[PDB]
Specification:
This is part of a larger assembly, with three copies of chain A (419 residues), one copy of chain B (122 residues) and one copy of chain C (110 residues).
Chain A: E1 9-19, E2 23-27, E3 52-57, E4 77-90, E5 99-104, E6 126-130, E7 134-141, E8 146-152, E9 169-175, E10 181-182, H1 191-194, E11 210-213, H2 215-219, E12 229-235, E13 237-243, E14 272-277, E15 281-282, E16 292-293, E17 304-305, E18 309-316, E19 322-328, E20 342-364, H3 367-376, H4 378-384, E21 394-397, E22 402-403, H5 410-418
Chain B: E1 3-7, E2 11-12, E3 17-25, E4 33-39, E5 46-51, E6 57-59, E7 67-72, E8 77-83, E9 91-98, E10 109-112, E11 116-120
Chain C: E1 3-4, E2 9-12, E3 17-23, E4 35-39, E5 46-49, E6 63-68, E7 71-77, E8 86-93, E9 98-102, E10 105-109
Parallel strand pairs in C: 1-9, 2-10
Antiparallel strand pairs in C: 3-7, 4-5, 4-8, 6-7, 8-9, 8-10
The chains are: A mainly beta (419), B mainly beta (122), C mainly beta (110).
Protein name (chains A, D, E): Major capsid protein L1
GO cellular component, one term (chains A, D, E): T=7 icosahedral viral capsid
Family (chains A, D, E): Belongs to the papillomaviridae L1 protein family.
């Protein structure tokens, strides 16, 4: 049986403030730009509709200096950090931004207009941009968050899948890492494999895997390491109703309609996609730039940061302004306007301030406690004496940024006034 | 390939109504703009007006009082009516597909009709 | 400029380059795209140049289009016997708010 | 270590009311109109989407009269003001206003087909007006608020930036001036230098520097001088989705689309701009015309106004109605309408009324306190016995408008009610 | 020095109910229709976007019949009514209403692409109707409310204003009287003098003065006569973005755009007007048909009604339905429809139920108290032994509608429940 962490973790009265100064990323919101073309280095895909998974590195509390050495016995105890408070200051201006495809696979507007009621074989892809679902999620764990998405199933050797048929959708629970794409109103789905047209969703999610956190799976985790703090707010609606061009693989049954004459003899395209849109970006519905305390957690792990590390999965699409930068081709800007003499660029900027209040906690390493922690994870005892190697995280280092002077920092002031 | 055909009376007596129709084969009419363009003999082309996909019209102002352009989605056709014709309205009429109204529209008339010679005489 | 200024006729040696000019104004050619069309009597006109230089599929690459100021030019390189046909220019006049067309240029292959 | 100001600043019961009579500005909401066109003096650029930074000048309490001479000892003490309460009264009616460009750099309506688009013109810039994001923000400090924006980076001597390329973006933190322009849904950036076509954003923000207050630096200020009181209220959404006409400097990768034939052989413009809009201007979502007290501040400065001055940075876009004024060119108004013979003017008006409740504060100038304030800012000790001199503010001088009779004034009445 | 009224006014336990039974006005919502078209008398301009200032006349309590004659001394005490409770019952259904101009000076829709984007000449004015901002305000004072608007300034004789130039805007504070038109989202401005087109705004505000209550002016009033009770609720947004046709005196600077070609060789019309619109008329946002008590007031008068009179400035645009009345020009209504044989009339209706609970109050006329009353208003001593003569107020006479039995009336029952 997995016990709550408060039984064997003794929380001391001393606290620390740890905060990165400013985390800034500027990059193209739709794709990574390769080196060259005036860029000596690559331009990352920096987007608001993207997972900002910060791997916070904490110093090993058994090693560095402490205000009182005699608070623990190194012979029979070990130390660990517990997150007592968090503030993800997302400091950009609030704004809306669009992701779009130059060739968006929409047939026609099925919402209002008398558009068409036939199969269309010619190319009717239009340059279409949409906004997305306005979502904010903030997940703190001592393990990275888990994300569910829909992808292609395995190829059965007994019954191979014919080309053009719909592959079986299966639910993959991958790890929410930095650079992963959040749900955008088109569904948490592998668009790179399940959409061979590469034209049904905008460019930032055209060949990306949109992942949604399976809050059921990481709350049903026995130890609750992946997620001990979570905040959710999603908001969307459908602006425009669009038919998707192409052959209908699943033909509409004859018992669902009555045949017409000529153009309405056969049903047209019946795969319908809505245009997602976060309704209104409003400042009072923001769950960031606010202090959040961790007195009780959803799982057994009550904020205790095992292996001296933290994982903060943050999505905030409420600041999605893609700055538009145009540069004239000629060295002096001409008096007459020519459209082809101005190169256009979109740059999204992400600005963060991760502040935390940590609590020093001692571990009375008796026989039962040591056996329980060894059964929980054998690496903790090996460290006390890295599975996430290929995973891409925004590694923020707070080794030398721990401070006892809480009143000198904003989150420390709010923690002192709330306690 | 999109093909345009013009049908109508070749001879129209003066001060009657000039009626023509254009049929589109191999393409759809609910996508682009559809224009009527006339060439009197001895001179160049003259624009008359166009019909949209939704049914909105634009016309040459100098003929705006005398030109009515209709569209038939079911028949896949669009018709020109020119009331009170004179001797100067004898022309070769071409219906054309003005590619307009979307992002990848080329502008102008990618496909042209062969045109029908309408002579106004008594 | 209701009628775009074009030469009445043009001539050139086969295999050479023949340039057909089209003069308009600041409201029709300079501010809008010009489209160059090939037309023979008795047949439908065929589009050659769109957006002042681009060519559709099936149009030979020997045809070229340029636009300088209020003037446009259609260049035919490697003149052939099948090119003995009319050519004209079309653009949109914002001042007149119409489609203005050139007078036509009957090209003779000499 | 920076201490809270309550340790060395002693609050007494002597309160004062200081109120500006009536602040009014009238001017063109898009550009400054120079003199010579038929008007005396220059008509200023007065916009609601613009920073109103009041420099409130207070009298020195060590020289002017006091109710009690023996309230302090001048040999061992010096006085300072502390803002106990604030009232930013706004007189003008709630309203919406439009800013727009006669040549707005938009290529296509990427939302849907509009049936008004014409692809025959090379220059597709048209007269387009948008509303902006609904922004209310009130910042009181003893130093002006720090605002961030995005600007072009420095030019590298080793590797010069080729003309037409995207310049590197840097986040500049400047002082929020009176007349700086607030975020408008287009992002906080230097539109003068980053945007060369002068056509992508409306007329007031076309050649201005839109700034967003960097609350991370003002909160993370060690002394809390720049911002000890703050309120925010932002609201926006995307009305219309637009393309950007111009060459794509960041070419879309071939893996993100499938090529067509003709105009769909190459992808179109993929720089997408939304039309911002503060959704509904409601009177229930107002943080102005309301009394706000300063019992506790966010920083170590608890409302103490050093150098006998206050800085009030106010943005109020909820009263943004630009009055439309017509003048007939003929001295009798003509009987029949001719649009040529009427001159149209746009004039925006700002009405402000600043009440403050200030508290007298005695400071015992011991050796440690004097050393701490000298390490803080030595000009306080120089004045007791002007860095912001080139920078432009709306100066309001309440040197002769301090009063002991609080009940005579509305904010004083509310303060006496709450006390 | 103005003092609070509770020091020299003694509140008695005697309460009275005063109520006008039913106040009904029917009139054309856009203009006044003079007699002569086949009807008796003139149809007034009755609109929902119009100030309803009720001059409530109270009986003089020094001679009014009272339950206890010996409750005061006639020689050394005088009497006054104090407003203890109010209810502005609104009778009509909640509704939206439209006002417009047959020639509305708009050039083109700058919301998006509109086609025929440049109207070079000729008359462009279009039959355009709008709704207005949803405004509910209720102000009780013993003096009429002060409303501000923007009008033409005084032309200097040394420097006269040239014809066609923009006149200087001056903020005039007038008295809010009955029939004054409220601010409607177009600005609190004098449209008669500042718009010579007479086509810029709808007909009900075309040649009227739109006024907004100067809450700062009558809140900073020393005696607090004009406003001791106030409720505001304003709600608007911009439906359509329109461009003002006409010559521009304020030419757009050349450095603020890039010159185009042909039709874009000059900047177009750049004065932009939004279409105001109260978003949703919803029943829980109503501040009317509700009882409001006056235990404390923002000013110094705590509901004391000097000169035995009250002023209730109420506008309620939530019931704005303009009824449409069709009358056939044939005595039998024909069975064959002809458009020209039906005459259309727009008639707006206002239904009001003014209800008050008043409190009897004694004034001990001590010599310094008498001097204070004489300094506040010398006409009070004259009455105890008018400036609003030319002002147009809706006079209601509650001299003979004062009742001691509160339980027979709804506001009396709600007051007895509250007390």
């Amino acid at each position: 049986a997995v016990v709550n962490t408060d039984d064997y973790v003794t929380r001391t009265s001393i606290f620390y403030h740890a905060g990165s100064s400013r985390l800034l990323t500027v990059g193209n919101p739709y794709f990574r730009v390769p080196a060259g073309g005036g860029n000596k280095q690559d331009i990352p895909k920096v987007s608001a509709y993207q997972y900002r998974v910060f791997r916070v590195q904490l110093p090993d509390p058994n090693k560095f200096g402490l205000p009182d050495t005699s608070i623990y016995n190194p012979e029979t105890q070990r130390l660990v950090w517990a997150c007592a408070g968090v503030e993800i200051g997302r400091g950009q201006p609030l704004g809306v931004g669009l992701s779009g495809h130059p060739f968006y696979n929409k047939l026609d507007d099925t919402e209002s207009s008398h558009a068409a009621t036939s199969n269309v074989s010619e190319d009717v892809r239009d340059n279409v941009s949409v906004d997305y679902k306005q979502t904010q999620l903030c997940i703190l764990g001592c393990a990275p968050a888990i994300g569910e998405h829909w992808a292609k199933g395995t190829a059965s050797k007994s019954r191979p899948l014919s080309q053009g048929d719909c592959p079986p959708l299966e639910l993959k629970n991958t790890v929410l890492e930095d650079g992963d794409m959040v749900d955008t109103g088109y569904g948490a789905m592998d668009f790179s494999t399940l959409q061979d047209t590469k034209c049904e969703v905008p460019l930032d999610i055209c060949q990306s895997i949109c992942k949604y956190p399976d809050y059921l799976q990481m709350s049903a985790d026995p130890y609750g390491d992946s997620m001990f703090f979570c905040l959710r707010r999603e908001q969307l609606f459908a602006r425009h109703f669009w038919n998707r061009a192409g052959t209908m693989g699943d033909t509409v049954p004859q018992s669902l309609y009555i045949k017409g004459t000529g153009m309405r003899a056969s049903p047209g395209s019946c795969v319908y996609s809505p245009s997602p849109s976060g309704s209104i970006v409003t400042s009072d519905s923001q769950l960031f730039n606010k202090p959040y305390w961790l007195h009780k957690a959803q799982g057994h792990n009550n904020g205790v940061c095992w292996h001296n590390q933290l994982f903060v999965t943050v999505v905030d699409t409420t600041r999605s302004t893609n700055l538009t930068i145009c540069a004239s081709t000629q060295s002096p800007v001409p008096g007459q306007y020519d459209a082809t003499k101005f190169k256009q660029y979109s740059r999204h900027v992400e600005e963060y301030d991760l502040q935390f209040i940590f609590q020093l906690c001692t571990i009375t390493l008796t026989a039962d406690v040591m056996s329980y922690i060894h059964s929980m994870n054998s690496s903790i005892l090996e460290d006390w004496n890295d599975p996430y190697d290929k995973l891409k995280f925004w590694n923020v280092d707070l080794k030398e940024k721990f401070s006892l002077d809480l009143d000198q920092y904003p989150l420390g002031r709010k923690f002192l006034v709330q306690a | 390939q999109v093909q345009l055909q013009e049908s109508g009376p070749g001879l129209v007596k003066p001060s009657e109504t000039l009626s023509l129709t254009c049929t589109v084969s191999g393409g759809s009419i609910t996508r682009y703009h559809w224009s009527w363009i006339r060439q009197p003999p001895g001179k160049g082309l003259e624009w008359i007006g166009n019909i949209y996909n939704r049914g909105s019209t634009k016309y040459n102002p100098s003929l705006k009082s005398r030109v009515t352009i209709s569209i038939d989605i079911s028949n896949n056709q669009f018709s020109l009516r020119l009331s009170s014709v004179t001797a100067a309205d004898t022309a070769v009429y071409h219906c054309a597909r003005w590619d307009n109204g979307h992002s990848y529209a080329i502008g102008g008339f990618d496909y042209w009709g062969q045109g029908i010679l309408v002579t106004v005489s008594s | 400029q209701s009628v775009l200024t074009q030469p009445p006729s043009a001539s050139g040696t086969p295999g050479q380059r023949v340039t057909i000019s089209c003069s308009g104004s600041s409201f029709n050619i300079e501010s809008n795209y010009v489209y160059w069309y090939q037309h023979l009597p008795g047949t439908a006109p065929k589009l050659l140049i769109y957006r002042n230089n681009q060519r559709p599929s099936g149009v030979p690459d020997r045809f070229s289009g340029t636009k300088s100021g209020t003037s446009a030019s259609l260049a035919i390189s490697g003149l052939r016997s099948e090119d003995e046909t009319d050519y004209f220019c079309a653009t949109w006049d914002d001042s007149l708010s119409v489609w203005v067309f050139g007078g036509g240029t009957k090209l003779t292959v000499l």
